[PDB]
Ligand binder design. Structure first.
Ligand SMILES: [Mg+2]
Ligand SMILES: [Zn+2]
Ligand SMILES: [Zn+2]
Ligand SMILES: [Zn+2]
Lengths: 41, 40, 62, 42, 357, 287, 103, 62, 61, 424, 97
RNA sequence: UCGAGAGGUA
């Protein structure tokens, strides 16, 4: 249901998603992606 | 561009000068000292 | 940076309590209970034991 | 006595041109600390 | 959850809107915009904290590191997700908002002499000197002076106390000329390491690093996490501080007049939250109550003042963050309670001796 | 016009913890005793450190600073003379009166990390052995190799300078308040209001007696002088319900030592030093 | 450095007050609030003493100035010595009481 | 943000609603470049050119 | 530094910088993002009233 | 022929930039054990227009004897007692001194015993006045001294002062009466420091120094602090709720007053006349259109700002009703040492009006809420479509305060308003 | 008024327009708000007085208190030659000439 | 050392 997930579960999921985002891209990823794109193509 | 030319040349050669026997330091507060006394 | 000794604010010796604190944290003990087990009644010593970051491990590894 | 970089070897070279490590190839050397007594005020 | 089917999207966290240097500030929305800007722009950059875990590989000029870096008692969602302790650079000390014989006027700072001497806010400064040679490195000019520390290779031995007027890098020609580099008037320290390297072109490079431990002096400038900036007006002995009922003396004393002008609420909230976190929750209860303490200080998710007051009351202290203190000089009990709390402070790179001319 | 007659009652006494009550004295005497025992009692601590091998990652000055803070037994502190006062020697190595030599040598020849604690610190005089509590205070952690050899000298010093010769650890004293209850305005209060008044106290200073259905004073020494119950009573409409005032001639002292000297010995040394200070301050008559 | 009394300087100096009779100022060198506060509090117990107080005008200059005003019955120096003796006797009594309590 | 002159710039020094969530509006350098230099937000990503062509997929949608 | 393990990286970088700079002459150089007008949207200006079509690669404005 | 600097030498001290002639002050050298810093009396900060937060004062040592002689005869601090700009006194009490004087002259309910009074008399140059309080209770001995008599030891016996506005009367150097206001303490036309300077002009500096020391000692005995109770500005939770509701109603009334004031234009002369108009309901039904009209028009914006300030004075006046006497913020505001009433209102009750002088492309949608930020027709989303708009004069009201916290939209509005201060 | 062309003085043009209502306007106190042409219209003294009034108003707006003699000296110094010169170097050179 | 460009202090 809409409210079956619970309020605390959503907060925990937001924290976990933020952690996953910081683990995947990192603090600096725009410069790395721009430099990699320039070298490859 | 030497930056010392025209009006700036005048300011830095005749108007504004540097002198000897001068000291520059950070200042703090000391209520014990009198109003006309400076701590050195 | 190893655990600071002498508890800058208070003056109590806390140098030899870091290993015990880590051992207590290894078990099912919260930070407050672990600090209470070490007999730290003043919150300055608790802050010193809680706010320390173990940096010597990275110095030895790197 | 000078310590090399990634390789552990004492160059012990004092010549002006000798700047490259022997049998290593890298040209980075660290000065070694000898056994000297130094006093500090705690 | 209040009203569904009307919101297409949702935000993971409102604190992520701010920058990395701004989201870590506790109670950011409770402070004036100017002070938040100052803290997030200048004071964050000027803080002295973790330098590096591999200082040997770096010959960078003016490297500074704190002896005992400490993470703040409060937690931030951004800092928790980043899982890095390098965001906060400084140490948290007991700060009391009170007047001290007029020595903290004009947003000045009074610190405890005893606390600093135990190892608080003590940092080391490492400065590197570089010389390039394509004349060669060597010790020359026998019996000229200021060359006692120089060895046969032209570099001082590690562990020598270098003062002004002494040669740090010795370069001499085959004809006896000395193109050596000396130390200037304000240059001093103890040599840490000597690094010799050369490029593919064949030019030789020499680096000598001098280190010196810096202790907080009078003219040293310190800043807080909420834009409060000042210099160390006076150093007071521990016995003269207004000790509390349990003998906890404040490490830092600040003038109350700064708060109405600077308009920086939240620093008091930060102090109260940190005090509530640090104080032992005994309550004579067997149940584990330490797992129900408000610790996060996320800017847009800050806890209410009522929750902070309740948490502080459950710790056995006054709910308003102030405690009764006794004058250290006479022993009498002060009429008004003094607000005390373990706020997080930062030591800026600006020093008194660096400004002396 | 003449001297006072203080009375001392000891509640708890241990090697490092002492709690006693001081009565029939002014606040100035207690404050001076606290200041003397926290900043004037001398102890022995390392001040000069000489090292030869410093292959450890930690800097030499950091190691010296954390060595100087190690607590040492100071049973001979009163008898020992100051380094500046000691004229038999200029100060080098072991001295019979002022300087005590300490030797430390650590070499790691195993894969496991070696911890240089305070237990492996040897001195010529057994009486100046560092206080043992446990694993001891960790000085430096060493990887494979990385030898650390040093020579240290400990001298008598006052706790006023460098704050490392202070044996006391937050010595405190309170006024020992007395609690006064009207006992007539409490009857007008309802049962619900009594519970709220009890909950207003930050610490357990008042208790509710179920048999008599009235509040009682339990543990009056933990009031901490927080005007929470008085403010609550004023808010409820009872201004003079509870009157609490400090007692000027009664005090309760809490002395915690760092292990250098015993707490009772610390108090005795503080009293002796205050007496010596008074004798020095005493001025001879002039005609 | 600060602990050592300056060479050639006596710890206590006596200076009479010309404006006020039976008034004197005692300058105690290398002293702190510990001695000054207890001396001031002990002087108030004396009936002959009218004005008793101390000040530390300059924290850097480790000096204590004690001003004593007495009636036409005892000299300020006499009251000062009497207060010092009474404080010494009180310290002796406290030491004896603590020694008895420990045993 | 590059501007020909620093004293006279216009409304580029002030925060904009388009800055919401992209660049921090509370932290900007103080001085000549006030608002010209903007710090990126924590949840800030910069798009990159896509090798694939979406023209063919667009016709499939309708 | 990228690819493979980081055990050799421990005997090297301090693992505190993710790496976005350039080593030109021993000094770290970091690019600063430059904000430029979008060239794939019609731009309408005032005084005078005009609408301009930007050039993608060659000057075909 | 050169000797080192020592006590008694005069050095010309300056704080760059020199905005006025009083920045140059000749001060006698006083050697101190401290190093790498110079110590200055906090009272002397006003002539230098600087604070102890990293300011560097560079001095000039005169070598010629003639320059030294002319230095202490014209540029000395005692020579510059009278401000040459307005004719008033150059030196004031200072923050701590002013606050301590206000506290010691306002309370009148705290009495000092013989020991504390004699301890404080050491710094005061004049003799101790009679206790004037022999018995306060049937069983209370040890006659006490009132607080106002402590401040009376700062005036010469021949000095006479009268300040009708604050009901201050000083006869024979004794402060007879005082009611409130603290205007005589602060710098002004009839400040007591100016009268003292006009009286003797020889020992005014010593009087100020002794007053500062004595007030610092008295304040240390008392203790001044800022706690969460001061920011709460309420005795309990019920008082806080009442204050919040009162602030909300006051803000609503101020908004309605601004809407009424906006009608004072030539376009509504038919409606403002005393006649029969059926469009009365349409004037009050369009509540969101008034904000859009105000943001587009500059004259309407100025009128609305003036009306909002006039109506918000009453809202600011509620702090005295909901504020305790012991509140540190109220004490510092009344004494004039630091802050004012509006800063306290922003601290506790509400920030209030937030407007920017420069023209911008966006506008605040009158509510500063999450729902407002998502409205496509809000002024923040470019234009409201009521034909488009090109520039706006932002106008927003923040109901929340710093203590309660700010939602991101309110923080954005505050940052937009305050960004102009950081400009060069 | 409109400064479309400086061919004719604005004050003189206004005087010609107000001919039917000359009695209504109190011409004994009416004066141009500008300082530069007020000297040409009513004399140097009237312009100096208006300049002093404007300077006092500006000082009051600034919030500071300044003695009257300073403003009077400034006004008398900026109109020594009978014409209010500019603060630029051109005005100083013209005043010296 | 003589310059230029940056980054900061009040
Ligand atoms: Mg400043
Ligand atoms: Zn502690
Ligand atoms: Zn090699
Ligand atoms: Zn000896």
């Amino acid at each position: 249901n809409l409210s079956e997930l619970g309020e605390g579960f959503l907060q925990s999921f937001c924290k976990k998603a933020a952690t996953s985002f910081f683990d995947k891209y990192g603090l600096i990823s725009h410069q790395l992606n721009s430099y990699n794109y320039f070298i490859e193509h | 561009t030497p930056k010392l030319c025209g009006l700036r040349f005048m300011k830095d050669v005749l108007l504004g000068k540097r002198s000897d026997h001068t000291f520059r330091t950070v200042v703090v507060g000391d209520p014990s000292l009198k109003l006309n006394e400076i701590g050195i | 940076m190893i655990i600071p000794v002498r508890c800058f604010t208070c003056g109590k010796v806390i140098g030899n309590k870091w290993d015990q604190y880590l051992d207590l944290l290894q078990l099912d003990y919260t930070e407050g209970d672990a600090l209470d087990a070490l007999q730290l009644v003043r919150y300055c010593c608790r802050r010193m034991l809680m706010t320390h970051v173990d940096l010597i491990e990275k110095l030895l590894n790197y | 006595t000078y310590v090399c970089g990634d390789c552990g070897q004492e160059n012990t070279l004092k010549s002006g041109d000798v700047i490259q490590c022997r049998e290593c190839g890298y040209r980075i050397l660290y000065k070694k600390r000898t056994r000297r007594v130094v006093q500090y005020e705690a | 959850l209040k009203e569904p089917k009307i919101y297409t999207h949702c935000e993971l966290d409102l604190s992520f809107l701010l920058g990395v240097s701004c989201a870590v500030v506790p109670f950011a929305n409770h402070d004036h915009g100017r002070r938040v800007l100052y803290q997030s722009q200048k004071h964050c950059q000027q803080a002295i904290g973790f330098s590096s875990t591999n200082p040997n590989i770096r010959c960078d000029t003016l490297s500074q590191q704190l002896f005992y870096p400490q993470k703040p008692l409060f937690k931030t969602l951004a800092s928790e997700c980043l899982k890095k302790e390098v965001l906060f650079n400084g140490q948290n000390a007991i700060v009391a908002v009170n007047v001290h014989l007029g020595y903290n006027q004009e947003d000045s700072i009074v610190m405890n002499k005893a606390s600093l001497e135990r190892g608080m806010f003590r940092s080391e400064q490492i400065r590197s000197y570089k010389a390039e040679v394509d004349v060669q490195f060597g010790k020359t000019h026998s019996k000229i002076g200021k060359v006692d520390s120089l060895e046969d290779d032209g570099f001082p031995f590690i562990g020598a106390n270098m003062s002004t007027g002494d040669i740090v890098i010795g370069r001499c020609t085959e004809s006896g000329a000395d193109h050596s580099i000396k130390l200037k008037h304000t240059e001093r320290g103890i040599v840490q390491k000597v690094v010799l390297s050369s490029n593919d072109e064949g030019k030789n490079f020499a680096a000598v690093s001098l280190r010196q431990v810096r202790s907080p002096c009078l003219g040293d400038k310190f800043s807080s996490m909420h834009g409060q900036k000042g210099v160390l007006g006076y150093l007071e002995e521990q016995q003269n501080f207004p000790f509390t009922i349990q003998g906890i003396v404040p490490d830092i004393v600040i003038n109350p007049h700064a708060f109405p002008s600077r308009q920086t609420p939240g620093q008091l909230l930060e102090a109260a939250l940190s005090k509530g976190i640090a104080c032992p929750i005994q309550k004579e209860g067997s149940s584990a109550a330490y797992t129900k303490l408000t610790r996060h200080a996320t800017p847009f998710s800050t806890p209410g003042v009522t929750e902070i007051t309740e948490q502080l009351h459950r710790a056995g202290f006054s709910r308003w963050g102030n405690e009764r203190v006794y004058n250290g000089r006479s022993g009498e009990m002060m009429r008004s309670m003094i607000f005390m709390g373990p706020t997080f402070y930062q030591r800026l790179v600006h020093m008194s001796e660096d400004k002396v001319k | 016009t003449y001297q006072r007659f203080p009375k001392i009652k000891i509640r708890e006494l241990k090697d490092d913890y002492a709690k006693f009550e001081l009565r029939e004295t002014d606040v100035s005497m207690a404050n001076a005793l606290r200041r003397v025992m926290i900043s004037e009692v001398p102890t022995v601590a390392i001040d000069l450190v000489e090292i030869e091998v410093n292959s450890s990652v930690l800097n030499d000055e950091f190691i010296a600073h954390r060595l100087g803070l190690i607590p040492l037994t100071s049973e001979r502190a009163m008898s020992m003379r100051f380094s500046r006062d000691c004229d038999a020697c200029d100060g080098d190595g072991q001295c019979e009166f002022c300087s005590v030599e300490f030797r430390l040598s650590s070499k790691c020849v195993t894969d496991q990390t070696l911890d240089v604690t305070s237990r492996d610190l040897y001195s010529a005089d057994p009486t100046v052995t560092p206080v043992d509590f446990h694993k001891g205070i960790i000085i430096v952690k060493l990887r494979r190799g990385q030898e650390l050899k040093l020579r240290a000298i400990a001298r008598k010093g006052i706790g006023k300078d460098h704050a490392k010769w202070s044996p006391a650890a937050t010595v405190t004293f309170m006024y020992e308040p007395d609690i006064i209850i009207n006992e007539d305005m409490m009857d007008t209060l309802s049962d619900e209001e009594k519970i709220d008044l009890i909950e207003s106290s930050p610490t357990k200073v008042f208790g509710m007696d179920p048999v008599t259905r009235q509040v009682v004073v339990v543990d009056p020494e933990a009031y901490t002088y927080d005007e929470e119950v008085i403010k609550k009573a004023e808010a409820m409409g009872k201004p003079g319900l509870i009157e609490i005032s400090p007692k000027d001639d009664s005090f309760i002292f809490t002395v915690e030592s760092t292990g250098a000297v015993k707490a009772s010995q610390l108090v005795l040394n503080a009293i002796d030093l205050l007496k010596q200070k008074l004798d020095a301050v005493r001025l001879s008559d002039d005609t | 450095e600060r602990f050592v009394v300056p060479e050639g300087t006596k710890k206590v100096s006596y200076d009479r007050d010309t404006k006020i009779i039976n008034a004197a100022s005692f300058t105690v060198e290398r002293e702190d609030h510990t001695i000054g506060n207890i001396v001031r509090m002990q002087l108030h117990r004396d009936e002959n003493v009218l004005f008793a107080g101390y000040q530390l005008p300059h924290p850097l200059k480790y000096k204590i100035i004690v001003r004593i005003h007495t009636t036409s019955q005892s000299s300020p120096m006499q009251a000062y010595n009497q207060a010092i003796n009474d404080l010494d006797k009180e310290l002796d009594y406290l030491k004896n009481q603590f020694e008895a309590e420990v045993a | 943000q590059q501007v020909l002159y620093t004293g006279k710039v216009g409304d580029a020094r002030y925060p904009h609603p388009s800055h919401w969530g992209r660049v921090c509006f509370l932290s900007t350098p103080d001085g000549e470049n006030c608002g010209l230099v903007k710090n990126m937000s924590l949840l800030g990503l910069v798009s990159t050119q896509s090798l694939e062509s979406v023209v063919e997929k667009l016709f499939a949608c309708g | 530094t990228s690819e493979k393990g980081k055990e050799n990286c421990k005997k090297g970088d301090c693992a505190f910088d993710q790496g976005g700079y350039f080593v030109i002459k021993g000094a770290e150089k970091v690019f600063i993002a430059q904000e430029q007008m979008c060239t794939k949207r019609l731009w309408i200006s005032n005084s005078p009233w005009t609408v301009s079509f930007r050039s993608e690669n060659k000057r075909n404005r | 022929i050169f000797r080192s600097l020592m006590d008694g030498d005069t050095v010309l001290m300056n704080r760059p930039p020199s905005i006025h002639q009083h920045s140059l002050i000749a001060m006698t050298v006083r050697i101190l054990p401290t190093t790498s810093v110079v110590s200055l009396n906090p009272i002397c900060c006003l002539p230098f227009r600087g604070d102890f937060d990293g300011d560097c004062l560079h001095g000039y040592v005169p070598q010629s004897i003639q320059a030294k002689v002319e230095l202490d005869e014209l540029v000395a601090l005692d020579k510059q007692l009278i401000n040459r700009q307005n004719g008033r006194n150059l030196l004031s009490l200072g923050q701590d001194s002013l606050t301590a004087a206000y506290l010691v002259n306002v309370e009148k309910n705290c009495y000092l015993n013989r020991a504390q009074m004699q301890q404080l008399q050491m710094y005061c140059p004049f003799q101790l006045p009679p206790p004037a309080i022999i018995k306060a209770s049937p069983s209370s001995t040890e006659p006490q001294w009132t607080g106002m008599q402590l401040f009376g030891m700062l005036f010469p016996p021949g000095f006479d002062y009268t300040y009708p506005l604050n009901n201050v009367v000083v006869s024979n150097g004794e402060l007879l009466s005082f009611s409130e206001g603290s205007a005589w303490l602060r710098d002004g036309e009839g400040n007591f420091i100016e009268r003292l300077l006009k009286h003797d002009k020889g020992k005014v500096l010593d009087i100020i120094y002794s007053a500062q020391e004595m007030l610092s000692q008295w304040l240390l005995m008392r203790g001044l602090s800022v706690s969460l109770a001061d920011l709460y500005l309420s005795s309990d939770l019920q008082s806080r709720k009442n204050l919040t509701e009162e602030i909300s109603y006051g803000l609503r009334e101020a908004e309605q007053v601004c809407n009424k004031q906006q009608l004072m234009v030539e376009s509504w002369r038919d409606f403002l006349a005393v006649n029969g108009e059926d469009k009365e309901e349409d004037s009050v039904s369009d509540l969101a259109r008034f904000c859009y009209e105000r943001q587009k028009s500059a004259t309407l914006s100025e009128l609305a700002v003036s009306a909002f300030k006039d109506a918000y004075r009453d809202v600011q006046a509620l702090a005295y009703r909901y504020g305790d006497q012991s509140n540190s913020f109220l004490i510092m505001s009344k004494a004039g040492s630091k802050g004012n009433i509006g800063k306290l209102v922003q601290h506790s009750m509400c920030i209030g009006l937030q407007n920017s002088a420069v023209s911008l492309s966006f506008g605040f949608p009158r509510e500063l809420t999450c729902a407002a930020w998502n409205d496509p027709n809000s002024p923040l989303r470019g234009a409201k479509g009521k034909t488009t708009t090109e520039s706006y004069v932002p106008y927003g009201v923040i109901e929340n305060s710093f203590l309660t916290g700010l939602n991101p939209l309110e923080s954005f509005v505050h940052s937009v308003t305050s960004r102009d201060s950081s400009f060069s | 008024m409109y400064g479309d062309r400086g061919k004719r003085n604005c004050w003189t043009a206004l005087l010609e327009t107000c001919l039917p209502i000359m009695d209504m306007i109190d011409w004994g106190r009416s004066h141009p708000d500008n300082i530069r042409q007020c000297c040409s219209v009513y004399g140097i003294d009237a312009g100096r007085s208006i300049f002093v009034a404007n300077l006092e108003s500006a000082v009051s707006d600034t919030g500071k208190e300044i003695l009257r003699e300073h403003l009077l000296l400034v006004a008398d110094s900026l109109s020594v030659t009978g014409e209010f010169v500019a603060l630029n170097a051109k005005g100083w050179s013209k005043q010296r000439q």
